[PDB]
Design a protein around this ligand. Structure first.
Ligand code: NI
Length: 341
């Protein structure tokens, strides 16, 4: 059944709750972003109102074939009324189209639902600065102090410098980047930019990217693999067997592959820095795991919550085990006692 952490009290609303059939008492289904664990269940047969960003609406229409009459896109940073309730959509700094949602309940309670987010100090100057938030529905993916990772900028600088060096030493090296969803487009676009190439990909992935309102996108991507020296493949193909196989397909145009797997966290983060990362190598193939995160580190999450000072926190991630729930509750109490709210 629909879990309580997916329901907004005092409303008929639900958030990211499309796999339970008809939720009794739901008048509007919000969708924070186009990731499959969140949209699971949507299709062309859905006949209730879906509220979301413009970009998420583009993907629902073109990729899932949801009918236009049920898609309700909202602009960001704008007070909107939905079924008699004031709401605002904020940029979540996750993947393209991803939002946080502010609900203003008729009784005066203000609720923030973060969706999936990477907390940033820039959020402290959004419309969130303007009133008190009583209840926070929080993306707790990395809520434990072992989870450190570098800035996105630092990671992109490493990837750009590595690729440019490799290809300038060997003009017959191919760069391959893995993907299994939207997000992390900066990794492959930044590398293609330094190399003066477009990125080449399947027809399905090109279609997905043409939904994202990325400026000058026609200048940066292509379905013609032969003309491109940055290829995107399914994350599943980023291993030595999959990459050897891919290299056969290019007809002796290339004699070396340098591949990037943008992971979330990996336990080499507790010891090693970004400057010190090394690849796994077999023969003429090298694979780099780079810690490019679209979720809060522990310290980013803690700073956001200690700034916001909510009265009650409702985790939305890692809620399935008692040991996870208890650990998270301990951190929330620590944060509250340190900051004095
Ligand atoms: Ni997500």
């Amino acid at each position: 059944t629909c879990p309580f952490y997916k329901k907004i009290p005092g409303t008929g609303f639900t958030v990211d709750a499309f796999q339970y059939g008809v939720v009794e008492g739901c008048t509007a289904y919000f969708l924070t972003h186009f990731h499959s664990d969140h949209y699971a269940g949507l299709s062309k047969h859905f006949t209730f109102p879906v509220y979301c960003s413009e970009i998420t609406g583009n993907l629902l229409k073109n990729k899932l074939h949801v009918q236009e009459q049920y898609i309700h896109p909202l602009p960001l940073d704008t007070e909107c009324i939905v079924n008699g309730v004031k709401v605002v959509l904020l940029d979540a700094n996750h993947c393209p189209g991803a939002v946080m949602i502010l609900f203003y309940l008729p009784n005066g309670t203000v609720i923030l639902h973060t969706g999936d987010f990477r907390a940033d100090p820039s959020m402290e100057r959004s419309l969130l600065a303007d009133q008190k938030v009583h209840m926070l529905y929080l993306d707790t993916t990395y809520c434990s102090p072992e989870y450190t990772f570098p800035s996105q900028q630092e990671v992109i600088r490493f990837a750009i410098n590595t690729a440019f060096e490799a290809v300038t030493l060997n003009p017959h090296a191919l760069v391959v980047c893995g993907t299994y969803s939207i997000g992390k487009e900066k990794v492959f676009l930044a590398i293609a930019d330094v190399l003066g190439s477009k990125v080449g990909m399947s027809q399905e992935k090109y279609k997905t990217l043409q939904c994202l309102n990325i400026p000058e996108i026609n200048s940066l991507i292509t379905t013609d693999m032969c003309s491109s020296l940055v290829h995107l493949l399914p994350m599943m193909q980023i291993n030595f067997k999959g990459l050897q196989s891919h290299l056969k397909k290019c007809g002796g145009k290339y004699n070396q592959i340098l591949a990037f797997r943008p992971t979330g966290w990996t336990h080499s983060n507790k010891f090693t820095r970004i400057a010190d990362v090394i690849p796994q190598t077999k023969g003429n193939i090298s694979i780099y795991g780079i810690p490019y995160s679209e979720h809060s580190s522990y310290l980013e999450m803690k700073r956001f919550v200690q700034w916001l000072k909510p009265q009650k926190i409702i985790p939305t991630v890692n809620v399935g085990t008692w040991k996870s729930r208890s650990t998270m509750e301990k951190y929330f109490r620590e944060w509250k006692l340190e900051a004095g709210y």
